[PDB]
From a paper:
Gelsolin is a 80 kDa protein displaying six homologous, gelsolin-like, domains (named G1 to G6) existing as two alternative splicing variants: a 24-residue shorter intracellular form and a variant secreted in the bloodstream. Both isoforms bind actin fibrils, severing the filaments and preventing repolymerization. Gelsolin, in particular, hosts eight calcium binding sites: one for each domain and two incomplete sites, which require actin contribution. Moreover, mutations in the gelsolin gene are directly responsible for gelsolin amyloidosis (GA) with 100% penetrance.
Here we report a structural and functional characterization of the isolated G2 domain of the N184K variant. Best diffracting crystals were used to determine N184K structure at 1.05 and 1.7 Å resolution, which will be hereafter referred as the orthorhombic and trigonal forms, respectively. Only few amino acids were not modeled: residues 260–266 at the N-terminus of the orthorhombic crystal form, and residues 256–266, 158–159 and the side chain of 169 in the trigonal crystal. In agreement with denaturation studies, electron density for Ca2+ was clearly visible in its binding site and the ion was refined to 100% occupancy in both structures. In the wt structure, the C-terminal tail is wrapped around the globular domain and is involved in extensive interactions with loops β2-β3 and β1-β2. More importantly, it provides a sort of lid for the calcium binding site, contributing to the hexacoordination of the ion with the side-chain of D259. In contrast, in the trigonal crystal the C-terminus dissociates from the Ca2+ coordination, assuming a stretched configuration. Such conformational change leaves the calcium ion solvent exposed, with a water molecule taking the place of the carboxylate of D259. Nevertheless, the calcium ion seems to be still firmly bound to the protein, as its B factor is comparable to those of the surrounding atoms. The open conformation of the C-terminus, observed in the trigonal crystal, is likely due to crystal packing: the terminal tail interacts with residues of the N-terminus and of the β3-β4 loop belonging to a symmetric molecule.
Numbering used by the authors: 148 to 155, 158 to 257
The structure:
């Protein structure tokens, strides 16, 4: 019809962590939640950002892919796009959501 005036889903962040047992758990959407030893999945609805820290292990990296693709396929009927980045290669879209990055420790 001519006017759509009655309303009406939110950003989420998942931590992917473990070795023997790799677990995905929801955490606050914030840079403060990120850790260099794990992988994180930032669900923005139409885009999913998959980020692995420099010290993440292979099982976390594999599980992170499974989680990203699971949201894409099971929740977004395959239409959301997945972007893999890592520590230091984050795309501008992540910074728009999460704001300025945590500074690196002096002397890198
Ligand atoms: Ca880890
Ligand atoms: Cl991308």
């Amino acid at each position: 019809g001519s006017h759509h005036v009655v309303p009406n889903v939110v950003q989420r962040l998942f931590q992917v962590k473990g070795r023997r047992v790799v677990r995905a758990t929801e955490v606050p959407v914030s840079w403060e939640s990120f850790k260099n030893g794990d992988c994180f999945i930032l669900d923005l609805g139409n885009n999913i950002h998959q980020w692995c820290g420099s010290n993440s292990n292979r099982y976390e990296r594999l599980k992170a892919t499974q989680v990203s693709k699971g949201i894409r396929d099971n929740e977004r009927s395959g239409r959301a796009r997945v972007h893999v980045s890592e520590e230091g290669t984050e795309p501008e879209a992540m910074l728009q959501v999460l704001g300025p990055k945590p500074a690196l420790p002096a002397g890198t």
